[PDB]
Amino acid sequence: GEELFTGVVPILVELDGDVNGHKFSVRGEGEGDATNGKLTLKFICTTGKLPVPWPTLVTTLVQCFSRYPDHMKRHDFFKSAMPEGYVQERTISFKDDGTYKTRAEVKFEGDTLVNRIELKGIDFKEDGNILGHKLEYNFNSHFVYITADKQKNGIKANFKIRHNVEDGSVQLADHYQQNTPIGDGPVLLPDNHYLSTQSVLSKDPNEKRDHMVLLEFVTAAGIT
């Protein structure tokens, strides 16, 4: 799949969500560039006002675009499954609050790398940090710790996302993640390694809808 990730690649993101009964959709459009490890995307709430904070959806809203050092190019599970793609499933547990269960299909449709997601959020506390919109419109940098799954012919990741809250606290969102290939093949099963992740959130001034502009930089490390 590498050759598919030389140069820039256009991206489409689709997310249908339901959190404590509130239903919504998100559409994301942009460009990735795995040589650099760089995404630039604009997501729009296609259905109205987003019932949850934009930052809680960042990890859900294309890890195939991780810049992999040449001395690790063989541990790049994500790229090795293209163009056919992968299923990405997570349990995201917000500390002291609800849980997101997500299922996404990531794959090429022609030229465009597509992310189509269903998200279901349960047990969210009314006027918690999430439903009570107390989270800052920013993001921190994280480590995403990956290991292979012999059995599923795939990988597992595990990381804790730290969301800044308006009172200066930190809402942890614990992430367990499971990826399995779609198409038929053996795929690249990595020894233990991580992704170093960095992200910046911003707004487009001439956009009258509720939206999120995202810049992300990701590179893989942990192997010498």
| Binding residues for Mg ion (CB under 5 A) | 14, 25, 27, 46, 69-70, 101, 103, 118, 120, 142-143
Cα 194 to Cα 76, 87, 152, distances in angstroms: 11, 19, 19
Pairing of strands 86-94, 38-45: unpaired
- Smaller CB separation from Mg ion, 165 or 186: 165
Closest separation in Å from C-beta 185 to Mg ion: 25
- Smaller CB separation from Mg ion, 101 or 203: 101
- Smaller CB separation from Mg ion, 96 or 186: 96
Q: Are 52 and 121 in contact (CB under 8 A)?
A: yes
Return d(Cα 22, Cα 136) in angstroms, integer. Answer: 21
- Smaller CB separation from Mg ion, 27 or 156: 27
Please give the residue whose beta carbon sits closest to Mg ion in the complex. 69
The structure tokens 């490390």 sit at 221
Closest separation in Å from C-beta 22 to Mg ion: 15
Closest separation in Å from C-beta 72 to Mg ion: 8
Which of 64, 67, 24, 70 minimizes the C-alpha distance to 44? Answer: 24
- Smaller CB separation from Mg ion, 74 or 185: 74
Q: What are the start-end ranges of the E strands in the chain?
A: 9-19, 22-33, 38-45, 86-94, 99-109, 112-122, 142-149, 154-164, 170-181, 193-202, 211-221
Closest separation in Å from C-beta 150 to Mg ion: 25
Closest separation in Å from C-beta 184 to Mg ion: 25
